[PDB]
From a paper:
The sensing of pAgs in target cells requires a surface protein, BTN3A112–17, that has both intracellular and extracellular domains. Here we show how—in both humans and alpaca—multiple pAgs function as ‘molecular glues’ to promote heteromeric association between the intracellular domains of BTN3A1 and the structurally similar butyrophilin BTN2A1. The BTN3A1–pAg complex functions as a composite interface that directly binds to BTN2A1, bridged by the pAg molecule at the centre of the interface.
Alpacas possess three butyrophilin molecules: VpBTN3, VpBTN2 and VpBTN1. Among these, VpBTN3 accommodates pAgs and is required for γδ T cell activation.
Author numbering:
A (entry chain A), B (entry chain B): 323 to 513
Write the structure that this text describes.
Amino acid sequence: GEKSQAYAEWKKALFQPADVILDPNTANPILLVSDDQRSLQRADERQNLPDNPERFDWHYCVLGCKSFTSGRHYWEVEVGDRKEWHIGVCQENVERKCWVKMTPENGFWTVGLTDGSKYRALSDPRTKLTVANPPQRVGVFLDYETGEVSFYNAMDGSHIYTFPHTFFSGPLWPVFRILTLEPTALTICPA
Amino acid sequence: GEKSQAYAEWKKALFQPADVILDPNTANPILLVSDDQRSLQRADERQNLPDNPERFDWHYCVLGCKSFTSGRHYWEVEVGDRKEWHIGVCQENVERKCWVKMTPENGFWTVGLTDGSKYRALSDPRTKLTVANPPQRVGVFLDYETGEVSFYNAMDGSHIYTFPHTFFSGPLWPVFRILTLEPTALTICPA
């Protein structure tokens, strides 16, 4: 398809493919990280984990294993028919233990889905998205220098959302959040 | 402040600022192009102007005086409170005389406003946009090499719309369309 091909070529012209794996030491104790570190599920209740300082205690979040301090990066996430998910990037210095709202002001740039059909950007206030075809696979695109975080339907190349250009402070991490206990996992596409 | 600053730094970092002036020779006869070639209004009825080959005779369109065959470019348009307008880029080879639907397949990449409140991308089908803050000034962003046409609120840096990445055929011209008679002109911001 021409739109698929143009999407493939744009990613190659401009963005380094990140090979993102989930860091289980950061995962909220209700999350399960797969042994291959590409997939995420949710437990029925908090499991017994050591509360190391990096772990998200409150928000159902996990980070990637590598951060970005510069340049243009993308990765793709198989959200499949999940009813609920949010993905994007967050600053190294985000609050991990106490509650904070997951907003750019607090160092989170994420978009996703609630209740099967409600797409939102987690701006403050939240941005209601209108998405013609529900994505099965989402591309996350970072340009550190221009402060750009944008999201695409990775199967048809359609744009989902771009946050206002911002100024990042410190390293950015891929972040993933699931609130629900449902059959479809969240899975990272390898580079 | 930071949103405006980051928007300014991004467009300066990556996009060549276009100084766009309207070509009255291309303008549908119902259009009025200002003396300084920055502003566009509609007449009550078609003026008696020659149907030279470059003039749009069907769509209420006018082009800029320079095309893009390479590079990244931007320009901003003061739409103010005008209840109807569509802006973007089109191919040099668009149908100017006969009815065609303004779509990417027909060589037009445009977004805008109908009846005061209905924002759309003129994709096929049309994309209903949700815009929480109605723009007064719209930034038009072209990247020829990656087939990218995107639109921003130029006052607060908030994203409006990005077409799917495509493959461009030949030169791209700034294009402007107004259907209605109303008090507020469209005005191009100088570079």
